[PDB]
Amino acid sequence: SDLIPAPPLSKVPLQQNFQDNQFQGKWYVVGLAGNAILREDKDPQKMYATIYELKEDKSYNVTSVLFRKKKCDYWIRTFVPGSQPGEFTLGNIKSYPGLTSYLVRVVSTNYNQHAMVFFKKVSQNREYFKITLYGRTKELTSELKENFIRFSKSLGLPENHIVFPVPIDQCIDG
């Protein structure tokens, strides 16, 4: 009902010279921040993974897996290339009830260790945004994590809207 407003796109940098082929493969979600992301010490969020695969038409098949209720839950989406390289929109938006808008922007990455990706969506007329700290391994440095916190706070998010999922072995080691 009450949400921190989505930042203007001007405050969200784009990764220059984005190599879509180098971004393919498994990323661990080492950090999560957003207006719908709430820290919870009763049941801390478990780490999940996201796999990016380039298709023939240069769009990503994006498969994520998380460990929930003793089972691995998979969910798939298609990122269609947007206006500029490193920016995407959701394919087949009509298949998602309530969804009128969905934008993805890769803020930064070195392709072999870390990445930061900005997501923006409008669902049920409510505007959500999040930033994911991607890791090639399950652990990242304190320097990279503090940079993620800095960037998240620059978009208007407080600390309790920034979480670092706990590493697990189930589902995400495949």
Q: Find out whether 111 is annotated in a ligand binding site.
A: no
Q: Is 35 in the site for Cl ion (CB under 5 A)?
A: no
* Closest of 152, 98, 100, 159 to residue 129, by C-alpha: 152
Contact residues for 110 (Cβ-Cβ < 8 A; gap 6+):
none
Q: Is 74 in the site for Cl ion (CB under 5 A)?
A: no
Q: Single out the residue of 9, 36, 38, 54 in contact with Na ion (rule: CB under 5 A).
A: 9
* Closest of 119, 115, 155 to residue 31, by C-alpha: 115
Task: Report the relative pairing of strands 126-135 and 25-34 from DSSP bridges.
Answer: antiparallel
Q: Of the two residues 75 and 146, which places its CB atom closer to Cl ion in the complex?
A: 75
Q: Of the two residues 143 and 169, which places its CB atom closer to Na ion in the complex?
A: 169
Backbone angles phi, psi at 124, to 5 degrees: 55, 45
Q: Find out whether 71 is annotated in a ligand binding site.
A: no
Site for Cl ion in 77-96 (CB under 5 A): 96
Q: Of the two residues 36 and 54, which places its CB atom closer to Cl ion in the complex?
A: 36
List interacting residues with Na ion (CB under 5 A): 9, 68
